[PDB]
Symmetry: C3
């Protein structure tokens, strides 16, 4: 069973589900809206080999980022053009990792699923490459896997980026 | 808990869940198949900035559409080649928005998830860029976020495009 | 309600859910990890028309495969370069189908959802193009829909590739 608005409020009130920061206006009928952080990771190795430690750079934006589809031919002139035209701080192509602002802790009897916002899916911007279920017992911010699939998309710091849907477990998990 | 076939039938019968049109043959073990509409939206601005109103054109197909991956080099000659070879009415690359034929209304105690058809996922055609949970209380057709990720894919008007999975809420939502 | 670890163990023990092979170490708090098979399918027609029978070749790898994003300009020299540098047996671009090692059977009162591993989603490698719910009553291995969206990704035979999440149905399905 999926937690309704009033269940989300109860679970947050009693600290069964931790959400930091929490804004009651982000509680929907059966979900909780989460927001986009200002820190991003971009990988800079040639290939991804998960048997090795991955090299990355960390980027922090002031206000906004333009996320371009893979293979956009981003010359330095094209980047300046986008920065001046759309007032973005950073222009990237292909995948970038972001984070929610929100830190969560899930109890042993709840699993949550992260879903990107449908307004963004309608412009072919994704913030998750998987279905996004999160283990009972999880503690952390949510790592966002961001890719644009059609045209460049402007993302703003602190914008609503996605939602958490909470489900009851049938029985409590071991941790 | 996910509604089984017999639950879907009960909820449709009593008008708890509205599905228009409804075909009982589309009820699966624990889902309801939905179908592809003939109307599509294609964006025609340079970038997607959701702080602004988005400019789009609306396309209506007679029978079928060829959806090509982004950056397919669609010359006007290549388009004619595809139209004559595969008998499609329209050829597009990158993202296009479609719709289900089906209009739904969800009660305060059900959330539904849209999932694209696995026969289509196996040819790398997606009709949703997000996990696809739909709020309790939702009324509307489902907007499809269509992208091909490998080779062009022919889609046919009225074909089964995806499924709705219905879940009980733990408690009724406020609207 | 989602099955916890102890529920997964009960259901496997009594043969309500069949998982072959089964490794108890793959049981998580509320999911079961599945692994990557050594057999892949690659399509070799020009377009995907699901009204026709699809032509494919079958590839079997010894150890590992490099999955490159669509439109990677894989010359035969670039392929040799990747094979020698990263010790992979096969180099592919765009979509490829794989399979889990695990064969499952679901009873009439459970639906399962396949989700790709988050370590892989964080490198923009997907193994499912849909939300991945599987019918109550399903029997089979899980077909993986594999695409890389940023840079090439090495996948290893038998690696953990994704997870199954099991949910109770509200009522038993008819088959």
């Amino acid at each position: 069973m999926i937690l309704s608005d009033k269940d989300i409020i109860d679970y947050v009130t009693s600290k069964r589900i931790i959400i930091k920061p929490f804004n009651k206006d982000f509680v929907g009928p059966c979900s909780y809206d989460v927001t986009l952080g200002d820190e991003f990771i971009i990988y800079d190795d040639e290939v991804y080999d998960l048997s090795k430690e991955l090299n990355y750079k960390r980027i922090k934006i002031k206000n906004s980022i333009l996320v371009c589809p893979l293979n956009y031919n981003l010359t330095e002139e094209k980047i300046n053009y986008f920065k001046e035209k759309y007032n973005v701080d950073y222009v990237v192509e292909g995948g970038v990792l972001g984070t929610t602002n929100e830190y969560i802790e899930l109890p042993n009897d709840i699993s949550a699923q992260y879903q990107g916002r449908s307004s963004l899916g309608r412009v072919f911007l994704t913030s998750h490459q998987t279905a996004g279920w999160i283990d009972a017992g999880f503690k952390g911010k949510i790592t966002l896997e961001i890719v644009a699939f059609d045209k460049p998309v402007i993302l703003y710091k602190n914008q609503r980026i996605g939602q958490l849907i909470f489900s009851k477990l049938l029985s409590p998990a071991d941790v």
